[PDB]
Amino acid sequence: GAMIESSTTIQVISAGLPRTGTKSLKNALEIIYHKPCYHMYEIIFNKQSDIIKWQNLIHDSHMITTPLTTKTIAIYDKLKELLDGYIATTDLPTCGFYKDLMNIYPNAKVLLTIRDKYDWLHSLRKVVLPKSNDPWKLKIEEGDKVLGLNSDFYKLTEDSLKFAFQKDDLNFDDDQVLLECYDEYNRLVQETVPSDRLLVLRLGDGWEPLCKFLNVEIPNGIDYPCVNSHHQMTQLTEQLIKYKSLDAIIHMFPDL
Ligand SMILES: Nc1ncnc2c1ncn2[C@@H]1O[C@H](COP(=O)(O)O)[C@@H](OP(=O)(O)O)[C@H]1O
Ligand code: NA
């Protein structure tokens, strides 16, 4: 196909929850668009100063009146600031803001990444939200400290998940609650976003449906990304603990 000059603004809003292939999708969108895609790893690795900004935004988010009202505009302005220079959103904390992002970026299309609910829960428990009594939680925390992440990082994860699930509080250690929230969330995205504007992706779908949806050619000779497995995250955590810096081990984790 011909090369065309793409606008550096949000073109793709991915509503998919953490552990549904968001990092692979981030990488895929960056391959297509040649501009950055937002993801929690963007915060971890490039923008830790954004943590307090997202926390503030979530704190004020209850005041969003679903469109435009005054306080809504103030919130939309901060969202647009956070996402300046990016061409897509994936993962927490952005995913729960999908309806709002649709208003802010009326010409953006929406994706929903999904998978088997139990595989999702298993993955979530290994990486994002281990149970309180799980010894592995201590290892995650130790590795995270090496990255400069503290309690405010976990607070952002918690609060952005509460926001996505529209719960005032949430028993994070309760598998049944999380499973119900996952199903309800995915159902609601599909009820809310007009089908013309939505593509539902299952893990393994690869380039074809995504590229068709976006009117772009399939990147030549480049496989669809498969990254961020829980096994890989376990190794990352262990290596951070072992070496006590990211820069010492980063050569071992390409595409991160
Ligand atoms: N192209 C692909 N095909 C199949 N699974 C993929 C994939 N890309 C990512 N995944 C899976 O998606 C999960 C990561 O999602 P996220 O990036 O949103 O945190 C991991 O699940 P597992 O932990 O079960 O391995 C990972 O293996
Ligand atoms: Na399986």
List keywords for this structure.
Sulfotransferase oxamniquine resistance protein; 5 strands; alpha/beta; globular; 11 helices; five-stranded parallel β-sheet; binds sodium ion; 50% helix; transferase activity; Rossmann fold; binds adenosine-3'-5'-diphosphate; 256 residues; Sulfotransfer_4
Concise account of the structure shown:
Keywords: Transferase. With 256 residues, the protein is an alpha/beta fold.
The CATH architecture would be 3-Layer(aba) Sandwich
Number of domains: 1
The SSE string, one letter per element, is: EHEHHHEHEHHHHEHH
Question: How many helices in DSSP terms?
Answer: 11
Proportion of beta-strand residues: 5-15%
CATH class: Alpha Beta
The chain-level structural class is alpha/beta
Radius of gyration: 18 Å
CATH superfamily: P-loop containing nucleotide triphosphate hydrolases
The name CATH uses for the topology is Rossmann fold
- Biggest β-sheet: strands ordered side by side in the sheet: 2-3-1-4-5
Separation, N- and C-terminal Cα atoms: 29 Å
Attached small molecules = adenosine-3'-5'-diphosphate, sodium ion
User: Largest sheet at a glance?
Assistant: 5 strands, parallel
Q: Level of helix content?
A: 40-55%
Shape: globular
Q: Could you give the count of β-strands?
A: 5
GO molecular function: transferase activity
InterPro entries: P-loop_NTPase, Sulfotransfer_4
Protein name: Sulfotransferase oxamniquine resistance protein
Keywords: Transferase
